[PDB]
């Protein structure tokens, strides 16, 4: 929003200025660790991780204007080895390198408070996500994940709320729930067709009972009501 836009035009007086990233490119990865502060101005990405085993995990989706750190400021070392994979067709991102960031945030306080705000939104997001996922099984982890995407990328239509996102493979949907196999997801996904809360037509997910999803993930719905009110209010 407004705050995001002036951070945008804060960086551009200071000689760091965007880079186009395209689908499946990695702004940074878990094998070649460079420590950045990524200001993703526009587009859609996902934070992933491969293990010494090939087991994939979709931690989180970053969208719109947001900030992703790969380095600590005061120590300038890595925070953990992850992947910021682009999902949208294109994405603009401001790749600030970490031992630059302190001097930048020092000379303007309005914009540190911005990044501080987002990292606050992030701490509260993870805790919420962790809470609702951990209580009742993978089914909860699915309903939680669906509800997230349904709020962030959901659109109105006379057959339900559309999760308008590239091609959310069911294997990918399980990847956010820490699931290895599509069959485990297919089984769950249409307990949610029969219970009439989810349909899968046009190879895209349509939500029918938002109140169902809310019950299985109340801490997250709360997080939206508090940290992203404008979004939360579109679907009420």
119 binds, among its own copies, DNA, none (CB under 5 to 8 A by kind): its own copies
Cβ–Cβ < 8 Å for 11, 39 = yes
Which residue, 158 or 229, is less far from its own copies as judged by CB? 229
Report the nearest approach of DNA to the CB of residue 170 (Å): 4
112 binds, among DNA, its own copies, none (CB under 5 to 8 A by kind): its own copies
Kindly state whether residue 216 participates in binding its own copies, applying the rule CB under 8 A. Answer: no
3-class secondary structure, 193: helix
Site string for its own copies, 69-108 (x = CB under 8 A): x--xxxx-xxxxxx-------------------x---x--
Kindly state whether residue 32 participates in binding its own copies, applying the rule CB under 8 A. Answer: no
Out of 78, 88, 124, 171, the residue judged to bind DNA by CB under 7 A: 171
CA distance 54 to 76: 28
234 binds, among DNA, its own copies, none (CB under 5 to 8 A by kind): none
Return the axis-axis angle of helices 137-152 and 218-227, rounded to nearest 10°.
20
CA distance 43 to 65: 8
Query: For 141, what's the count of Cα atoms within 13 Å in the CB-facing half-sphere?
Result: 19
CA distance 66 to 228: 13
Please report, as ranges, the residues that interact with DNA according to CB under 7 A. 137-140, 169-171, 178-184, 186-190, 200, 203
């Amino acid at each position: 929003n407004a705050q995001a836009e002036e951070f945008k035009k804060y960086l551009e007086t200071n000689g760091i200025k965007p880079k186009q990233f395209h689908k499946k490119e990695l702004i940074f990865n878990q094998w070649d660790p460079q420590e950045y502060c990524i200001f993703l101005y526009d587009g859609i990405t996902k934070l992933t991780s491969i293990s010494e085993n090939g087991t994939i995990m979709n931690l989180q989706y970053y969208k719109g204007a947001f900030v992703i750190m790969s380095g600590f400021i005061d120590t300038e070392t890595s925070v953990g080895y992850y992947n910021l994979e682009v999902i949208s067709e294109q994405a603009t991102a401001y790749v600030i390198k970490i031992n630059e960031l302190k001097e930048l945030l020092s000379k303007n306080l309005t914009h540190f408070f911005y990044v501080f705000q987002t990292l606050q939104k992030q701490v509260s997001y993870s805790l919420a996500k962790f809470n609702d996922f951990s209580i009742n099984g993978k089914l909860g982890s699915i309903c939680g994940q669906l509800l997230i995407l349904t709020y962030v990328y959901g659109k109105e239509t006379p057959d339900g709320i559309k999760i308008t996102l590239d091609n959310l493979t069911m294997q990918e949907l399980g990847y956010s729930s820490g699931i290895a196999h599509s069959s485990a997801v297919s089984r769950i996904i249409s307990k949610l067709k029969q219970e009439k809360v989810i349909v899968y037509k046009n190879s895209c997910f349509y939500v029918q009972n938002l109140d169902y999803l809310k019950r299985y993930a109340p801490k997250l719905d709360e997080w939206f009501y508090l940290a992203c009110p404008a979004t939360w209010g579109k679907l009420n």
